[PDB]
Design a protein around this ligand. Structure first.
Ligand SMILES: N[C@@H](CCC(=O)O)C(=O)O
Ligand SMILES: N[C@@H](CCC(=O)O)C(=O)O
Ligand code: NA
Lengths: 263, 263
């Protein structure tokens, strides 16, 4: 009951955002968002206290094959500096070899963020040209999807992205969004559908292009042999069945920070 | 492994179906479908043999609350008469208290199966009348969703279903489909969206009414603390990422047994 867990997370709209505040904030009070609410609900049900700490390297977690070393939130778990990672963190085979994910709390797939009203209607339309540049978050699961694909269209896109100069990869979703929004049609961003929907609810000149290219989920990551994973799974399923995960999705995707006004 | 596992499953289109054969079949060879293909892939990767056994009481698994006894596939796992349950088996909070689950292999939600072309557009449209009767699979997660809901619409529908001339509940999805088809508008069946889609791909006079009422997943269930769950979990993620789960979905939902012919 007096247990205090360290939660690693990452700034990504609307999962975890700095509050809009002209006065100084500190601690957990600095942050809000879907993931902040989710960990609050989990901590209440299971009766622990927690400290939110942004991952110092601003990375989700990738594996360097040369060194065999992880970075990002995954590394914070493996090095025992965090007890839980709660974010838009994709459950991947590769990460699950190193850490243990909970059952999912959100489903998604890779898609395309671009401006509205253009001839680009699909990934095929992007891969077939070079006028519009396109990229993805560096080191994330979207980039890995393209890198590891054996579909010709996605192999062609990966080759284009790896070869492009200056880099088409971004350090964050937010950077990708800004590059689309201010790019005057010269850039499209490969982005997770959930994260796209937050943007398109608020920037009425942007849209998701095409459908989802794969299917995947976010889950809470825990270190190997964590004594909390199983209890958290029950909380997630309870919140799911009670409808509270959907309420939190509506709150952050349609209501907070000017959502839902694109006519 | 090596090793021979018992897999419990249940007849449900297209997850597990008896092959159509002039000659009586025996053993695993009598079955086919998405779940059969899935277990085949898992056994290939992990190197084990398996025996498919239909759950003898033909039930998914419900908890008699005052008795505390489970039935169905869940009971086969608890009694260690099966090593894995591989079916259109919903990951529920209640089941998670008793057995373990893998990460999901498929996502879905409750929806409505009814005839095409009517003015019924939503659950509310059914709830506000009494002419058209509606029901669900007895003892499944769809019925539980309605029984435990605090939404007035779904409380009204639950109250209607619990009181009945003949029961509006069914023993299988297939029974519910046949009651819709032969009911000529007198009956709607509350049914999982995945299973609806198999039907509406093949019976062009039936349709899904409205959207999904909740969000949930199927996963493979094991006895609690099974030593095989972790390994199977990783295979599911690998198959997901390779696109093989989607290939299997397309196979059974769009191709097999006359799929894909409705305009
Ligand atoms: N959710 C992704 C990051 C975003 C992306 O790659 O598109 C991950 O966990 O790696
Ligand atoms: N998949 C459900 C059965 C079908 C239903 O309830 O609609 C379960 O596992 O209980
Ligand atoms: Na793991």
């Amino acid at each position: 009951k007096n247990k205090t867990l360290v939660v690693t997370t990452i700034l990504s709209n609307p999962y975890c955002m700095r509050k809009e505040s002209a006065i100084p904030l500190s601690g957990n009070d600095q942050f809000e968002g879907y993931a902040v609410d989710l960990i609050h609900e989990i901590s209440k049900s299971l009766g622990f206290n927690y400290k939110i700490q942004l991952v110092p390297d601003g990375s989700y977690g990738s594996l360097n094959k040369l060194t065999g070393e992880w970075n990002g939130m995954i590394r914070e778990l493996l090095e025992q500096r965090a007890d839980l990672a709660i974010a838009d963190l994709t459950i991947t085979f590769e990460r699950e070899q190193a850490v243990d994910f909970t059952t999912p709390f959100m489903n998604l797939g890779v898609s395309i963020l671009y401006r509205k009203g253009t001839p680009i209607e699909s990934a095929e339309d992007l891969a077939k040209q070079t006028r519009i540049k396109y990229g993805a978050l560096k080191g994330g699961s979207t980039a890995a999807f393209f890198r590891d694909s054996k579909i010709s269209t996605y192999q062609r896109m990966w080759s284009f992205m790896e070869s492009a100069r200056p880099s088409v990869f971004t350090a964050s979703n937010g950077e990708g969004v800004e590059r689309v929004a201010k790019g005057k049609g010269s850039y499209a961003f490969l982005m997770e559908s959930t994260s796209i929907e937050y943007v398109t609810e608020r920037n009425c000149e942007l849209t998701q292009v095409g459908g989802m290219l794969d299917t995947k989920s976010y889950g809470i990551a825990t270190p190997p042999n964590s004594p909390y994973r199983t209890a958290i799974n029950s909380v997630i399923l309870k919140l799911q069945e009670e409808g509270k995960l959907h309420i939190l999705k509506t709150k952050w995707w349609k209501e907070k920070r000017g959502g839902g006004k694109c006519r």
